[PDB]
Amino acid sequence: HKIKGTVVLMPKNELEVNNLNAFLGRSVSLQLISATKADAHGKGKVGKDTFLEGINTSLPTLGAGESAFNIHFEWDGSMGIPGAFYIKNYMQVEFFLKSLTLEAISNQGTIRFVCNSWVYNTKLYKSVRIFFANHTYVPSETPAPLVEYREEELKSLRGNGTGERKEYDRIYDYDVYNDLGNPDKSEKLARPVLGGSSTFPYPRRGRTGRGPTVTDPNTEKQGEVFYVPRDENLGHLKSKDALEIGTKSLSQIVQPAFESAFDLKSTPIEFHSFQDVHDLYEGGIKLPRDVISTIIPLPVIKELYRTDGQHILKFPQPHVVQVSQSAWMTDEEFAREMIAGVNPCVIRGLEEFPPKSNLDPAIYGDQSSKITADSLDLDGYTMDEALGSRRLFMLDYHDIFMPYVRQINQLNSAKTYATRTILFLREDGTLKPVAIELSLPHVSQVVLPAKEGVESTIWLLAKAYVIVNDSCYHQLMSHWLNTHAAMEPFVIATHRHLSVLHPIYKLLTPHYRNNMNINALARQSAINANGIIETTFLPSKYSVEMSSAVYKNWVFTDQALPADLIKRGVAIKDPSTPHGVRLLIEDYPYAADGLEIWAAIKTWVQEYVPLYYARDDDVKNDSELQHWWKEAVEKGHGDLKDKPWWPKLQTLEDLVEVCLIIIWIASALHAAVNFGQYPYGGLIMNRPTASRRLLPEKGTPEYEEMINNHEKAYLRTITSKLPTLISLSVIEIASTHASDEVYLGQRDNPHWTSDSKALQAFQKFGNKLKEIEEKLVRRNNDPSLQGNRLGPVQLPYTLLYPSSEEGLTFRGIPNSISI
């Protein structure tokens, strides 16, 4: 009585960015664990230590880097049916275990194990590594002999809340954002703790445990590597797919190299004309040979530029200029990008006029808008008519930015206004900007559109100040806070409280791939003190703190797409429509395409949940699920735990809602705000990240310059040349799909569950996404929708096409927040 098995694994050398016979002998042991026969203590019986016997070269299903090994277990009639196994690696080097498959007389009796886990030397683990077969069980359905194993593995994953975490640990826990400052290096690099107070609320991040700095016991000391639990950093076969490593290289190597070129006056310090910026993707920028030779050897980085190996670095041409070099300058495109650009989810309907501020007048005085209704050209509408017909909209950054303008403007090389933009929905269905208000605290001018004269340059600059607001809000709030930061606590809670066996674990975990990893690298190099974001975006050392102020108002249930639209007053509830909302901007590309994706995910969740939960009772009674959600709210988002809007998770309908929102944030929402960054923002004049001066005052040389040289006046106002080179490089990385991405509708292994009904439902989901993609292609070819879906830049809105090939494609929805 012997069971034949096949082990598939990848040796360490295949998944690194920087011999098989050794696996034979007594170097790798496996022990099967019975699911049906228990020892005296009720635990599944354990078989004998069994070793890898030989290499299996005649296996066609092997992928790149994968090796298969034969094994033969002795398993007599007393042992029952296997359901789990132990593995002990006695080698000195870790390997990546993929799968164990046990053969049976019939092909239906095959038992499959999907592992996908790094296995380190047995002496490094407190308890032996255990893996379960791919059967799905809610806790009350677990075979009795596996219950204790299920419960103890979860205990292992939680740890005890103490200790410095090491590379091989698989311990998931929470901590505050106290690791961004670097006070032990310089007092000026001190940063506030974010999280754990009502003054600075914030989502938690993964605990690393390096301990305190010497100069501040509340700030965590720096480390060369920021830990994540080992299997959150899976590796890649090809180095060019390790995109997440790029920010570290940009900060530590590339940025110092660029800076030396500017210190040595080897290239002009400023752009002088728009052509100087267009040159970056045409002929390139010429840099010294020792700078080029430092950059081009680096993995990942070298893929960002074309070079001649001597003096030229050339950036790729951004989509937004691929047809028209100038269309970005039009009012039409400015407005269109608020519904179809990199940041499409901030605009709000106006139901009253003038707009009002909620700012404390004791501190900020009267903040009532100074825009008058009669100054606006609404194509012949009166204000009463345009309001009543819901044609007026705004991009309102006044109350968000005003509390920080004084502090920002005290920086030596930042100056900003808090802005409002008024939009009118024309009879042809496109948006028209009709006024911009530029405000300063104690101080407020209204700028109207103009096409001729010095007033047209002032209007151009006013649009730049608006997009500096918008770029900062996009990066820190729409992107970093709402997707990256908000999701990490749910990742942590899932691994701590839902068994790998659990149906909701299997539903959600594909939507977490690489999230903790990219976030930890971001804490180290992107959002740290003097990191990429602080040295490229307007608010400098205030950048992350500003996102904490916005998190005060973050509402989980308002992240659902229909709720968000209604809240922002860009849709109304309408049960006579497919999706239950009527779009007041009917053509709104992000929202109209997003609703299709939303509905597809909804159908998938509503078809998967009832396979495992028949009644509300089954949700209430699932102890893992209840512990998971309690911890996600009370610890992971614990600064908001008291808010009344958290779902209680006592019904089927709550479980669906929670899972749907999580999946939406991690896939389509992140994709829509992330993968258009270089396509729209690769031209720095279209998406400036910073402003450096206020408007010229009449009678000064800066004002005279504005009359005689509008391009120089514009370039002096926005992001300087050196930070432009950095910020372009980092948004080029972020806009790139790695070749090993897993997209919505895909999974990394087809045998993630043995439940044929769940597999069929998942197949239906993938088929529906292909049907939706064809629908969205038809929309982009529809001449009636050209005004908003293509615009004067002639750039089809493809950001919610579910599929994509590798590269910088402006399309494709990953499962997760992976970059």
Ligand SMILES: [Fe+3]
């Ligand atoms: Fe991202």
